[PDB]
Amino acid sequence: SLLSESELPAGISYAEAMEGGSRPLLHPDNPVVFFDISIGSHEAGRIKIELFKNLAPKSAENFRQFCTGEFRQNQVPIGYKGATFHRIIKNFMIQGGDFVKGDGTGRLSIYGSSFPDEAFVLPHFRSGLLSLANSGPDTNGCQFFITCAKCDWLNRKHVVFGQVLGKESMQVVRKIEHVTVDGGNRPRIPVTVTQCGEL
Amino acid sequence: XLLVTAXXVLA
């Protein structure tokens, strides 16, 4: 189901997304969520994210609940508040959302351990897209990445399910992308979602 | 390489 760049729907070009505010651009019922980011102990700003419920409803709803606190295990909420970005590769992507262990091992979703790939409709055609991290087919969980360049070699292996909105969002993404990392691409100073929610 | 996995990170 993969669309070529010439076939893309309105509202998801880089220019269109950078004009976005707090309301969705691809489909009017798409939720918009946010992360406030701290780099070390410094508030770095806010990333606003449209979740493409119209194209990837299960992936969007999983991410959305992790932003709002609506997913509970035995009455205890769990989600992205306090989650880190544990793997940062300049000119490629920033990876985070492992609220389980903070190291890439976390594989919990609102559906259980892992959930299937939805249709691979959108390509990784530009920076600023949200896509699911996984360990092969049908192993989506809680982790995600934000593209920092086109990464079309990931097409049909990772579901692109959202986009950042507005220029500040991309400024924060670029700041995260350029922090110092160790030999394993782990940041030397933590990058944390200190607050998150739905707009 | 440039993959985004959860568990065995590769080059």
What is the b/e burial string over A59-98, where b = at least 16 CB atoms within 10 angstroms of the residue's CB? bbbbbbbbbbeebeeeeeebbbbebbbbbbbeebbbbbbb
Single-letter amino acid, residue A78: I
Which residues partner with A39 through β-bridges?
A42, A191
Which helix H or strand E contains A77, and what residues bound it?
strand A76-77
Report the catalytic residues of A: 87, 92, 95, 134, 145, 154, 158
The experimental method is: X-ray
d(CA A135, CA A195): 28
Among the listed residues A39, A63, A62, A59, the one whose alpha carbon sits nearest the alpha carbon of residue A49 = A63
Which helix H or strand E contains A107, and what residues bound it?
none
- Residue in B2, B4, B8 closest to A133 by CB: B4
For residues A63, A157, B10, A90, the Cα torsion angle rounded to the nearest 10 degrees is -60
A window 156-185, beta carbon within 8 A of B = 158, 184-185
Contact residues on chain B for A107, CB-CB shorter than 8 A? 6-7
| Sign of the dihedral defined by the CA atoms of residues A126, A132, A136, A138, in that order | negative
Among the listed residues A165, A16, A198, A191, the one whose alpha carbon sits nearest the alpha carbon of residue A94 = A191
A113 touches chain B (CB under 8 A): no
Shortest alpha-carbon distance between residue A178 and chain B (Å): 16
The DSSP output letter for A195 is E
Task: State whether A104 and B6 contact (CB < 8 Å).
Answer: yes
| Cα–Cα distances in angstroms (integers) from residue A177 to residues A73, A96, A113, in the given order | 32, 12, 28
Contact residues on chain B for A105, CB-CB shorter than 8 A? 6-7
Find, in chain A, the residue whose alpha carbon is nearest to that of B8.
Answer: A135
Among the listed residues A160, A191, A14, A167, the one whose alpha carbon sits nearest the alpha carbon of residue A88 = A191
| Cα–Cα distances in angstroms (integers) from residue A35 to residues A6, A137, A194, B7, in the given order | 31, 28, 7, 24
Q: What share of chain A is helix, strand, coil (3-state, %, to 5)?
A: 15, 30, 55
CB A84 within 8 A of CB A106: no
d(CA A23, CA A48): 10
Q: What is the resolution of this structure in A?
A: 1.2
Shortest alpha-carbon distance between residue B6 and chain A (Å): 5
Task: State whether A133 and B5 contact (CB < 8 Å).
Answer: yes
Angle, CA A51 vertex, CA A16 and CA B4 arms, to 5°: 100
Selected from 2.40.100.10, 1.10.3210.10, 3.30.300.30, 2.60.40.10, the CATH number assigned to the domain covering A5-198 reads: 2.40.100.10
For every residue of A11-73, DSSP letters joined together read T-SHHHHHT--SS-SS-TT--EEEEEEEETTEEEEEEEEEE-TTT-HHHHHHHHHHHHT--EE
Upper half-sphere CA count for residue A15 (Cβ side, 13 Å): 1
Residue keyed to tokens 């309105």: A10
Strands A32-39 and A191-198: antiparallel
Collapsed DSSP state (helix, strand, coil) of residue A112? strand
